[PDB]
Amino acid sequence: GAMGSMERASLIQKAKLAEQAERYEDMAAFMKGAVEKGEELSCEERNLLSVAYKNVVGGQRAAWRVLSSIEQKSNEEGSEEKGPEVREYREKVETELQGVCDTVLGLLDSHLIKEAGDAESRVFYLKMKGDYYRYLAEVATGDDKKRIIDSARSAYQEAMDISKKEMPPTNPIRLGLALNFSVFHYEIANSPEEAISLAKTTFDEAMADLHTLSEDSYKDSTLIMQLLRDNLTLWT
C-alpha cells in the first residue's frame, strides 16, 4: 500500500490536516493506511475513518443520483435518442462508488470487526457495515440485489442487538444506528411502517433517559434525536 512507509501517527496527523482542508479523498487514503497498520482504532480514530469515507461516498452518491435522473428522463417516451454516453458515465460513477464501498467493507472484514470487543467499537463498525451495504443497495439492480439488502439488514440487526444490551438509549452511536436502520427500512426494504415504528420508539426511549445526562451529553444526544423527528415529519 502507498502509505506503508508512513508512520501511523503521521497518517493520523495528516488525516486531521486533510479534514481541515476539506480534502476528503486524501483523508480517506490516510485513514486506510492507518487501519492497515493492523492496530485497533481509538474512538477519535474511528470517527476520522467514518468522516473521511462518508464525505467521499456522499459526493459519489449525489453525483450518481444526478446522472440516474438524467438517464431515466432519457428513457421516457418522446425523449430524443442521445447514444450510450449517459448510461456509460452513470456506470463509471457507479463503479467508482461500488469500489469505495468495497474498500470500506474490506477494511471492516480485514480485520476491524473481528478485533472489536467493546460495545462502542463493535456497534460502530457494524453500523458502518450496514451503511456501506446500504449504499451498494441504492445502486443495485441485478440478481444479487436481494443478497446485498440482506447483508445490510444483517449487519444493522447485529449492531442493534448489541446496542440494546450494552448501551443506554441516549448513546449517540446507538441513536445514529437506529436512525440509519430506520432509513434502511424506509428507502431500501420497502418497509415504511417499520421505519416509522423504529424512529418513534428510539426517540421516546431516548427522551426518557435524558435526565441522566450532563449538559454536554444532552447536547450530543438531542442533536441526533432531532434527526429522528425530522425523518418522522417527512414520513408522516
Partner: peptide
Amino acid sequence: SYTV
C-alpha cells in the same frame, strides 16, 4: 431522509 436524514442519516449520520
